[PDB]
Design a protein around this ligand. Structure first.
Ligand code: UDP
Ligand code: UDP
Lengths: 376, 376
């Protein structure tokens, strides 16, 4: 037990997973562990440099000989070079593919029997939904990792179902860094963005993929809007943006839906919101829910995946069946009309997420299993 | 000794290397070995199906989760699946990167201690000329292979110099399949392509990269052309095509240089040629020289790399310093004016390449080292 030398690999900019992996490394470095990120040359935005937190980055070039940019090999070579230069104790890889495989290859290249934790975020299920070429790679990356974790219990279950492995998968929930998301409401920025100070605000934040079911979110909002003057803020960009814009026209809510594009400072938008919606068809955890909940925003989610673990239906928010804009709008109208209900769920919610998703508690759990695999 | 179950991975369409790897597999399958190609979905053009020669191919898709198409992992997974399904004895990987690494990863994924031969074609030197990110991967792929071969002695020497490894590298020359390149001259197609039946023809065949020094070839031809009515045929396409077209204008040989594009049936063009030129700055072997020489075409090459092993200066052709269009044109004019010299070099050449580069002899050498590593 004690100080560890840790190599972390993730996609630092790809959604929730990259945020989680980065914030976890920062928490570990603030405790005094020696933390090495090894990623491709993708930006990070670290605010305070630490001498014990080093970001190693690799360029993936094509050369005229490779048919494809050799990400897996270039990354594995860089991980192995950090293992040798800094005598790393363990690797923490995010995603079975490509990153568990990269860590396994880097272990071979380094000649050191380093321990490997792999954390599953749900992308390995997504890949297999498109085609089964990688079925054997995902099974191998899971089974040759020393410890495997998943960001929800639902994801651990789904993994066993789809991958067909006896490998133990440890559910360890996601978290937000509490000082990045102060619990507070602020109406100062509302006018800037064309929202009247009193107006109710519903927010959704995502990559605008079809799996997010923004169609259900806009349909929900249209039903809300005819009872309650309100705005729907949609943060992000992606494949469904134009079809969703068109949907707001067909439902006659175009002037009330704000497509604000990608935003780095999401905290300030949660601070002006009244409800957060994540009605996804598939979702291992749902980090935007937790970011909003920590801010104090009461959530409505679907019952897909881990969302029903994040939200306690009827206690800290509401959960609806996938695609049920009737029930979602019913709950939203009640929450926007009923301050007693809103205050009660919000109070329950703030206590619950402190209890189950606090950054200190989750970091302790990862740290515990780092040490467990180092002692096996 | 005897029958082997062999997995071969190469880029089937990338230059000489892909031709060599494919033709070697065909030779092995014709002997009765069980030959499995495992490549990405890149065409092959096999003329006769054999029950003991199977082409496995893998799609490399992006999925929205991978930042780069995961070639290395998808290929390694497919190799491992063939190892398990067909109980392969050994892998023959072409290129230290990516393919030696893929074979090494596939060995881990398969759970079988399969033997791995890696053949170096020179691309690993080229990659490192552009940047040194992959230095450690190339060393690892070489050192963790059971046997490493190189297509020339020059390349083995260069590898030791640049990679800094004590690993034994076995020079095994390239070959052409003799019935694909009958020794014969044919003027029937000359008129079709705007060449008078008697006109002397110089040919060059390449990927039109700067390393091929087609500028030296066109400068050589311009000096030839003012003494001898003649045509320069340039087969292929690539980055230097437009600058080379412009060069033929500046030298006033535009009407005498035929840019014929990429050609699959190169044999028919060698059959109408009088000289072949390969004046490359870097070149591990120079397969187009051997294809032309087997056809009966006398070569002029540079002294780079393995070209001076393929050509015996003054005996089976001529070798010049890189960029020396003065000497190259001097030799070319002599060969095109002097049938005694031409016939003598051509006779020496046809005997020499039968002795050192015959397909049966080279296949025997690969087969010998397959068996050697299976017995170690
Ligand atoms: O404009 C945006 C959109 C998303 N996110 C962040 O992206 C994460 C998860 O979003 P996403 O839909 O991209 O992927 P998934 O949640 O499915 O991982 C959350 O931390 C968001 O705060 C952000 O910062 N700005
Ligand atoms: O139009 C062409 C150009 C090249 N090649 C073949 O490509 C190989 C080697 O060519 P390249 O310059 O592409 O690569 P390198 O020789 O450097 O490997 C030889 O077998 C050629 O016959 C071909 O078949 N048709």
């Amino acid at each position: 037990q004690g100080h560890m030398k840790i190599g972390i690999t993730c996609y630092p900019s790809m959604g929730g997973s990259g945020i989680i992996a980065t914030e976890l490394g920062i928490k570990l470095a603030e405790r005094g562990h020696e933390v090495h990120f090894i990623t491709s040359n993708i930006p990070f935005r670290i605010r305070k440099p630490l001498p014990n937190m080093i970001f190693h980055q690799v360029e993936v070039n094509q050369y005229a000989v490779f048919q494809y940019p050799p990400y897996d090999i270039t990354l594995s070579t860089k991980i192995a070079e950090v293992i040798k230069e800094y005598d790393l104790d363990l690797l923490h890889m995010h995603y079975a593919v490509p990153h568990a495989i990269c860590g396994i290859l880097a272990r071979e290249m380094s000649g050191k029997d380093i321990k490997i934790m792999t954390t599953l975020h749900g992308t390995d299920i997504t890949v297999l939904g498109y085609d089964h070429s990688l079925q054997g790679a995902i099974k191998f990356g899971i089974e040759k990792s020393d410890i495997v974790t998943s960001v929800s219990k639902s994801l651990a279950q789904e993994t066993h179902e789809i991958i067909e492995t006896n490998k133990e998968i440890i559910p360890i929930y996601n978290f937000v860094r509490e000082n990045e998301f102060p619990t507070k409401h602020n109406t100062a920025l509302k006018s800037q963005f064309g929202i009247a100070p009193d107006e109710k605000v519903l927010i959704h934040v995502s990559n605008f993929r079809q799996v997010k079911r923004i169609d259900t979110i806009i349909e929900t909002f249209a039903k809300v809007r005819e009872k309650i003057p309100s705005k729907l803020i949609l943060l992000g960009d992606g494949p469904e943006l134009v079809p969703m814009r068109q949907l707001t026209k067909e439902l006659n809510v175009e002037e009330d839906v704000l497509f604000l594009g990608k935003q780095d400072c999401v905290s300030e938008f949660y601070q002006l919101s009244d409800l957060v919606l994540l009605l996804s068809e598939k979702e291992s955890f749902g980090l935007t829910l937790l970011e909003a909940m920590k801010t104090g925003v009461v959530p409505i989610g679907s019952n897909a995946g881990g969302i029903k673990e994040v939200i306690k239906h009827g206690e800290t928010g509401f959960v609806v069946d996938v695609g049920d804009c009737d029930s979602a709008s019913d709950y939203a109208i009640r929450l926007l009309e009923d301050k007693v209900l809103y205050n009660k769920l919000q109070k329950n919610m703030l206590a619950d997420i402190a209890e189950r998703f606090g950054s200190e508690l989750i970091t302790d759990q990862y740290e515990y299993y780092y040490q467990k695999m180092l002692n096996e």
